[PDB]
Amino acid sequence: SMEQVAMELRLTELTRLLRSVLDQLQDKDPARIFAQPVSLKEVPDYLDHIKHPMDFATMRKRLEAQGYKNLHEFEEDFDLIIDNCMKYNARDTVFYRAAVRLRDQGGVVLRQARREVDSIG
């Protein structure tokens, strides 16, 4: 139908905007600490601690399949990256500290993303 096409164009445009959001958030991780899944070869107990791992490569795969229906779903995954790290790693670690900085700097980007999503519809 024409409605299904219009809905698909809306999803495509959300995907475009989320891709720009993702790039901007990933720039706030210049050490690439969150770029890839935590390796289960190198951290064999990880899944005992963290039940829903996440990382920027995994979000990008989802994004490119148009698998985010709305900004809330995308933000859920970003928050998993931060929150998983802040539980697994102690406060005094470069990993924890990177997640705090990513959260703080990402807030600004996400605040405007929400306005754009609402504004453009």
Side-chain angles (χ1 to χ4, degrees), residues 6 8 11-15 17-40 42-58:
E8 294 161 358
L11 176 58
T12 297
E13 284 304 306
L14 180 61
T15 305
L17 179 160
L18 298 179
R19 193 178 302 109
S20 170
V21 174
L22 185 60
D23 287 346
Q24 285 176 69
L25 295 171
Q26 187 156 23
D27 287 338
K28 308 313 178 158
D29 175 30
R32 300 193 68 89
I33 289 165
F34 305 105
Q36 295 289 332
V38 170
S39 169
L40 307 174
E42 303 168 358
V43 189
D45 74 357
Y46 190 63
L47 299 184
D48 294 343
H49 292 268
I50 296 303
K51 298 296 175 185
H52 297 99
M54 191 46 53
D55 62 278
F56 290 127
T58 302

Side-chain angles (χ1 to χ4, degrees), residues 19-40 42-60 62-68 70-110 112-118:
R19 193 178 302 109
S20 170
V21 174
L22 185 60
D23 287 346
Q24 285 176 69
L25 295 171
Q26 187 156 23
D27 287 338
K28 308 313 178 158
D29 175 30
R32 300 193 68 89
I33 289 165
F34 305 105
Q36 295 289 332
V38 170
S39 169
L40 307 174
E42 303 168 358
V43 189
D45 74 357
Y46 190 63
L47 299 184
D48 294 343
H49 292 268
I50 296 303
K51 298 296 175 185
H52 297 99
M54 191 46 53
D55 62 278
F56 290 127
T58 302
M59 291 186 64
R60 196 170 294 278
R62 183 166 166 191
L63 178 67
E64 292 312 332
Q66 302 186 348
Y68 295 114
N70 55 56
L71 181 56
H72 181 72
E73 288 189 345
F74 176 96
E75 292 177 324
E76 285 200 326
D77 272 353
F78 178 66
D79 285 334
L80 279 177
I81 293 177
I82 299 314
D83 291 341
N84 288 345
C85 183
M86 292 172 73
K87 292 168 186 76
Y88 191 80
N89 303 106
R91 239 165 355 263
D92 74 335
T93 62
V94 62
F95 306 108
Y96 185 113
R97 292 166 171 280
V100 167
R101 291 164 64 82
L102 177 62
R103 188 198 60 190
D104 285 351
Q105 298 194 275
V108 182
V109 174
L110 290 168
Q112 202 50 41
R114 163 52 63 204
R115 290 190 67 85
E116 287 178 353
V117 168
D118 290 357

